[PDB]
Amino acid sequence: AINYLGAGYDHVRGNPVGDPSSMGDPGIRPPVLRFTVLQPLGGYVRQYVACRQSETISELSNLSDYQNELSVDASLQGGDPIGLNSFSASTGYRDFAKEVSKKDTRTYMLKNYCMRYEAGVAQKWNVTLAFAAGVSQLPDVFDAHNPECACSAEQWRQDQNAEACTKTNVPIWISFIEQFGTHFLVRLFAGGKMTYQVTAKRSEVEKMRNMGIDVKTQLKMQLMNVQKETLVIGGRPPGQVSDPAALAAWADTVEELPMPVKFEVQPLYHLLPVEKQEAFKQAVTFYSKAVGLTP
Ligand SMILES: *[C@@H]1O[C@H](CO)[C@@H](O)[C@H](O)[C@H]1NC(C)=O
């Protein structure tokens, strides 16, 4: 329907569970690979007989659990996480940091996957016109790899338009990344996904444990006084994310407009010339250092 294979991905700004202003992962960037229901040359696309459904529930005790649950829907090829402060710039990451810093509450996350098709690539690929046209503008050397450097991660985050950074080539590299991301999708399951972030008081969870009913089972069956945030992937935006009819309608608009809900990616330096590969790796390290949040 819509080509998402080979699209760029910003793993710093990515968020494979959603964003209130975007109907897809905010890290998804325009397609980088050029290609030829109908199978492309060098890859494969398989359709599903139904909306393949799957549910997963997990308690998110800290930002590591949140980032790990996110890593299941956006990892490197082979299940291994991307790392390097993944998703640390996404809005849904700071919101969860704020909600978990309270530390008097337990947060759970439920995921309903409604996957409709699967796409992937085999083992040396054509790239789009704009991608090669932007790579041609890239130097062979990343300046900020030199630790003595006017432009640093903290300097770039404070003022990127400062003369210290404008003298270096760093703003060039960042622009490229800001346009194309840090990775590209080599495999993807597209369709729809509904994720609930549940925020409950520890007193009520103690009450549930006293009653004997399982907290996770009660949360799955219910979707017992909680705060609910709803994140949506795929289909058309519902003007009120918290309505039963909004759910019922978006679930059917998913088929019309599916979007990647669980994908495996590959670093972009595999697509760059060998001379620029190490410089680009340094550049993406600098990018994760400057935009990501280590403290
Ligand atoms: C794109 O790649 C295919 C094989 O992946 C190749 O056959 C084709 O020639 C390439 N495109 C052009 C315009 O040559």
Numbering used by the authors: 465 to 500, 514 to 600, 605 to 704, 728 to 799
From the primary publication:
Toxoplasma and Plasmodium are the parasitic agents of toxoplasmosis and malaria, respectively, and use perforin-like proteins (PLPs) to invade host organisms and complete their life cycles. Escape from the PV, and therefore from the infected cell, for subsequent rounds of infection has been shown to be dependent on the perforin-like protein TgPLP1 (T. gondii PLP). We report structures of the membrane attack complex/perforin (MACPF) and Apicomplexan PLP C-terminal β-pleated sheet (APCβ) domains of TgPLP1. The MACPF domain forms hexameric assemblies, with ring and helix geometries, and the APCβ domain has a novel β-prism fold joined to the MACPF domain by a short linker.
Whereas TMH1 is packed into a pocket, TMH2 is more exposed to solvent, explaining its mobility. Together, these features cause the TgPLP1 MACPF domain to be somewhat bulkier than other perforin-like proteins, which partly explains its capacity to form much smaller oligomers than other family members (see below).
